[PDB]
Amino acid sequence: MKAVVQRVTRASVTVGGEQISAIGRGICVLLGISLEDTQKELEHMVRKILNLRVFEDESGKHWSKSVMDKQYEILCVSQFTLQCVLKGNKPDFHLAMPTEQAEGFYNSFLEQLRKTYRPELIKDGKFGAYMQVHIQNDGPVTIELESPAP
Amino acid sequence: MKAVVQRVTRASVTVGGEQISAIGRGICVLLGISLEDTQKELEHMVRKILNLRVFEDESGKHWSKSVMDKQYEILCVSQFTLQCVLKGNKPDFHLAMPTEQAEGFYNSFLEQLRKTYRPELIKDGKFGAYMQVHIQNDGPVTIELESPA
Ligand SMILES: [Mg+2]
Ligand SMILES: [Mg+2]
């Protein structure tokens, strides 16, 4: 499992100009699920996202508070392209989990996130859809996470 | 050297509320200079970014065309937070090149991009600054790139 995490002042997902979801301050997670991914990686990745210290405290010290410390929001979007192998210049996605299983895995992942944090502060894209993910990256701050190695 | 590349329908940078840079369709590249990066990694990374096949052809075939094939734009922003977290739950900076040496590499990287592609299609943020980077990720499509190893 891989994730790209971007700290946002706001973020939203549109499908065909229709706004699907939107968050204010918090974190946008692009989530790459691999073929070899299991419940262990699912649970480990949730813990890492929720505990990632990307926010300031009241004094303004950097890297001192997680999304949960701040009671901020999380926008998760499924992103199989992160499971890319770069032989030549064309991407190959053989390491990504196929969409039939991946949708179930993704849904279970979002559900662990909601039960570990607060459901109302967790927003999603639309798994199969051609989306525009509007990301107002605050800083910018961008962190790569991986769980096969936690 | 590490990069996160996002395919965009548009992207922009604001500092202090003012939009200082914007592109239309293309890629937004967040670039992380590492401690032992050389001109070698820099040249390799430019090449990879410029030929990355993240665009469709004119028949709609996925993964077939690069930014240059499409004559699309590139917004490049410096981002030192791309190094591995490994231990703890905060960004890790010990592997990032100190800002002083890094700024020279970053500017060299932009000059290489411009020389190898089209200068008028290349935009950047503002190296020192606290930026809002507005990214309309198209798909979304996101690719992680890395040189040395
Ligand atoms: Mg993200
Ligand atoms: Mg990017």
> Domains of chain A (ranges plus CATH)?
1-150 (3.50.80.10)
Q: What resolution does the deposited structure have, in angstroms?
A: 2.0
The experimental technique used to determine this model is: X-ray
Pairing type for strands B26-32 and B2-15 reads antiparallel
Nearest to A89 among B66, B77, B130 (CB): B66
3-state helix, strand, coil in chain A (%, to 5): 25, 40, 30
Question: Which residues of B are less than 8 Å from A53 in CB distance?
Answer: 88-90
Residue A123 tokens read as 């927003």
Residue A34 one-letter amino acid:
S
Residue A130 one-letter amino acid:
Y
Gapped junctions in chain A, after residues (C–N > 2.5 Å): none
C-beta neighbour count of A80 within 10 angstroms? 21
- Do residues A45 and A99 make contact, with C-beta atoms less than 8 angstroms apart? no
Q: 3-class DSSP state for residue B90?
A: coil
- Residue appearing with tokens 């989990």: A97
- Residue appearing with tokens 């890395």: B146
Which residues, 6+ apart, have CB-to-CB distance to B45 below 8 Å?
A: B1, B3, B31, B109, B145, B147
What is residue A128's DSSP assignment? T
3-state helix, strand, coil in chain B (%, to 5): 30, 40, 35
Which residues, 6+ apart, have CB-to-CB distance to B50 below 8 Å?
A: B66, B67, B68, B113, B116, B117
What is residue B24's DSSP assignment? S
Using CA atoms, how far apart are residues A89 and A8, in angstroms rounded to an integer?
30
Pairing type for strands B18-23 and A18-23 reads unpaired
Half-sphere exposure of B97 (CA within 13 A, CB side): 19
Which of B112, B144, B113, B106 is CA-nearest to residue B127?
Answer: B106
B5 beta partners: B29, B143
Give me the phi and psi of B83, to 5 degrees please: -75, 160
C-beta neighbour count of A16 within 10 angstroms? 9
Using CA atoms, how far apart are residues B50 and B69, in angstroms rounded to an integer?
9
Cα-to-centroid distance, A102 and ligand 1 (Å): 18
Using CA atoms, how far apart are residues B82 and B128, in angstroms rounded to an integer?
17
- Do residues A6 and A54 make contact, with C-beta atoms less than 8 angstroms apart? no
CB A90 to CB B4 under 8 A? no
A6 beta partners: A28, A142
Which of A45, A39, A120 is CA-nearest to residue A82?
Answer: A45
CA B139 to chain CA centroid, nearest Å: 18
Using CA atoms, how far apart are residues B149 and B137, in angstroms rounded to an integer?
28
Residue B116 tokens read as 């190898």
Which of B114, B7, B139, B77 is CA-nearest to residue A131?
Answer: B139
- Do residues B136 and B11 make contact, with C-beta atoms less than 8 angstroms apart? yes
- The protein residues having their C-beta less than 5 angstroms from ligand 2 (an ion) are B 4, 6, 28, 30
Terminal-residue alpha carbon distance, chain B: 10
Residue A149 tokens read as 């190695």
B113 beta partners: none
Using CA atoms, how far apart are residues A70 and A135, in angstroms rounded to an integer?
19
Question: Which residues of B are less than 8 Å from A70 in CB distance?
Answer: none
- Do residues A35 and A92 make contact, with C-beta atoms less than 8 angstroms apart? no
CB B137 to CB A133 under 8 A? yes
